[PDB]
């Protein structure tokens, strides 16, 4: 087993991105080891929609995409095939026929500040309901009425982003969580991510 697939650069990363501007890293031409993620660590949730956690070192695909971001505590159930809310509607939509895994662990020591963390925003006030695996990073005043908003906020013109306020005393339902989503793709091509 000469080569090896870098997962410590996706999990043990210092800056870990935001929900409305989530980061994606393509993985290929490696030999991944899934016996160090399932059978280790402190991951609170390890849900594998599609295929099961075991027998994951057998199947091998063409590409794997890792999506990393940060959300609240009671907002991790909205990352699932289906589901409706405010994150699965305006920030990150997940297709109904999904093959992959969802991982999240409580990172409260690293993403909490006395007074409030001013990073980690999330999108609010959108028109449509987004599409699977689609990002939007535009910051334009949300026009909620007939009268146009000429770049100035006021009545029926709102900023489309709200800031998570993270403090070291918020209760488990509001503490930050770090989420990583792996997506397995077999698209009519020779595989390059085959296991040990």
């Amino acid at each position: 087993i000469t080569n090896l697939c870098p997962f410590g650069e996706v999990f043990n990363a210092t800056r870990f991105a935001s929900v409305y501007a989530w980061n994606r890293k393509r993985i290929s031409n490696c030999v991944a080891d899934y016996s160090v993620l399932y059978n280790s660590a402190s991951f609170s949730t390890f849900k594998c929609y599609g295929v099961s956690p075991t027998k994951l070192n057998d199947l091998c695909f063409t590409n794997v995409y890792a999506d990393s971001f940060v959300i609240r505590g009671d907002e991790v159930r909205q990352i699932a095939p289906g589901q409706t809310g405010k994150i699965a509607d305006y920030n990150y939509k997940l297709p109904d026929d999904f093959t992959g895994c969802v991982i999240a662990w409580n990172s409260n020591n690293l993403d909490s500040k006395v007074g409030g963390n001013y990073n980690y925003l999330y999108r609010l006030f959108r028109k449509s309901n987004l599409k699977p695996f689609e990002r939007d990073i535009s910051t334009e005043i949300y026009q909620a009425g007939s009268t146009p908003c000429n770049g100035v906020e006021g009545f029926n013109c709102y900023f489309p982003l709200q800031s998570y306020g993270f403090q070291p005393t918020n209760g488990v339902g509001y503490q930050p969580y770090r989420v990583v989503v792996l997506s397995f793709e077999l698209l009519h091509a020779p595989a390059t991510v085959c296991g040990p």
Partner: antibody
Amino acid sequence: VQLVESGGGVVQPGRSLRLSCAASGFTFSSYAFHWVRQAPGKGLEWVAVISYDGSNQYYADSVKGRFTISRDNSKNTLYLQMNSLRADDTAVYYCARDLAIAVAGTWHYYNGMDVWGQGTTVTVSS
Amino acid sequence: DIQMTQSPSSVSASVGDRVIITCRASQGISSWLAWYQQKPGKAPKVLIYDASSLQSGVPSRFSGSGYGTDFTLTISSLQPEDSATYYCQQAKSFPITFGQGTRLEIK
């Protein structure tokens, strides 16, 4: 924007001394404040803090249990009582003011100190 | 109680000279830091907040960056109005802790 300071004392063996730093030129009721000392020639040291609505108060480790902070919005002035002063508390105290970084219309506190006072020379002896 | 370390402690340079100042944290305080400058007999003045931003009014000669444990402050040209002492500060949790300070001179 300007902060003034008053209350220095000649000899303070085990007495109570009240310091006050008055505000001027801005909205006093929408900011949090601070107090910071500096030894006679040594580094810079933190002693207390007050919230913007006055509900929460935090103190240092060589300061808790003998110094007390309070604020008044009517006179745009806030105070800091000190009880049973040791001879080893000589300093020059500074009133300060928190930086408030506003993102997406929400104000986040406790990010620094931008506006400073002049300095009060408080000396304790026998 | 996060302990902050600042090195070096005494340097000197003149006119068009670039100098570097390091600051180390016992934990990972992310991008929550501030730098100050105090002349020998006056109150301090904030220079750089958020560990990268620059206070409105400070000349653009100063610049500093970092994330996590290591931080830095760089002065592009040391003009003869920059002979003072500089301090760090962490804003992650209470109590607020400063660095030991560093004294400049004029070569």
